Design a protein around this ligand. Structure first.
Ligand SMILES: [Cu+2]
Length: 88
């Protein structure tokens, strides 16, 4: 239903606020354009994906509950590598 590219950079997400539709499928193209390994982790949406430097992971999600969900990189959270996903 929706396709969204998300860049994983050293050390931030772009975009770092992502809005996706409730009860519909969204494909996320997770592209690591950084030199470091990064993750795209949203525990409350059941997502936890590692993306190596220069590589890509493509996932399709279908969230059932409206809300705002914290997105983190497990490796660089403390450096501010964080964002959110709004399901609406
Ligand atoms: Cu990271």
């Amino acid at each position: 239903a929706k396709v969204i590219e998300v860049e994983l950079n050293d050390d931030y997400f772009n975009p770092n606020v992502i809005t996706i539709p409730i009860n519909e499928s969204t494909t996320l193209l997770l592209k690591n354009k950084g030199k470091s390994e990064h993750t795209f982790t949203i525990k409350k949406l059941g997502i936890d994906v590692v993306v190596e430097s220069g590589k890509e992971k493509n996932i399709t999600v279908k969230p059932k509950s409206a809300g705002t969900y914290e997105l983190i990189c497990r490796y660089h959270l403390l450096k501010g590598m964080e964002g959110k996903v709004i399901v609406k």
